Amino acid sequence: ENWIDAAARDEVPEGDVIGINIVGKEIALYEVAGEIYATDNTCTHGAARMSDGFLEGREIECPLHQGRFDVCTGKALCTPLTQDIKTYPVKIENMRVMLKLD
Ligand code: FES
Ligand SMILES: [Fe+3]
């Protein structure tokens, strides 16, 4: 229901993040303690691409001004940020990463 095969599970590296372009949306995939999660690959604060980089635990650090989001809830943690980032449901199925894009 807007569910889409988006990547192989093992394309997302332990503890790190990757960027994908898919159906015209740029998306970040994250590996956090055995689970996969997803957000927009664009920082809400500026023209910054979250896939590069720095994921520490469940916190992703913007490469620009070091704003940080909780990857599981999309909530903004520290300044400069003011706006939460959009999250997308994922399920892992037969080694595939599925996304609910709206
Ligand atoms: S651009 Fe990501 S914190 Fe300002
Ligand atoms: Fe640290």
Please describe what this structure looks like.
- The protein starts with a strand and ends with a strand.
- It has strands at residues 3-8, 17-22, 25-32, 35-40, 55-56, 59-61, 68-70, 76-78, 90-93, 96-100.
- The protein is globular.
- The chain has 102 residues and is an all-beta fold.
- The strands form three sheets. The chain has a four-stranded antiparallel beta sheet, with no helix packed on it. Strands 1-10-9 form a three-stranded antiparallel beta sheet, with no helix packed on it. Strands 2-3-4 form a three-stranded antiparallel beta sheet, with no helix packed on it.
- The chain has no helices and ten strands.
- A hairpin with a 2-residue loop joins strand 5 (55-56) and strand 6 (59-61).
- The protein has a single domain, classed as Rieske [2Fe-2S] iron-sulphur domain (Rieske Iron-sulfur Protein).
- It is 0% helix and 45% strand.
- It binds FE2/S2 (inorganic) cluster (FES) and fe (iii) ion.
- FE2/S2 (inorganic) cluster binds at residues 43, 45-46, 48, 62, 64-65, 67, 80-81.
Report strand %: over 45%
**String of helices and strands:** EEEEEEEEEE
CATH architectural category: 3-layer Sandwich
Strand order of the largest sheet: 5-6-7-8
Query: What is CATH's topology name?
Result: Rieske Iron-sulfur Protein
Q: Radius of gyration over alpha carbons? A: 13 Å
Small molecules (ligands, ions, cofactors) in the structure: FE2/S2 (inorganic) cluster, fe (iii) ion
CATH superfamily: Rieske [2Fe-2S] iron-sulphur domain
Our count of domains comes out at 1
Instruction: Give the helix proportion (percent range).
Output: under 10%
Assembly status: monomer
PDB class: metal binding protein
Keywords: electron transport protein, Rieske iron sulfur cluster, ferredoxin, metal binding protein
Assembly: monomeric
Entry title: Ferredoxin component of 3-nitrotoluene dioxygenase from Diaphorobacter sp. strain DS2
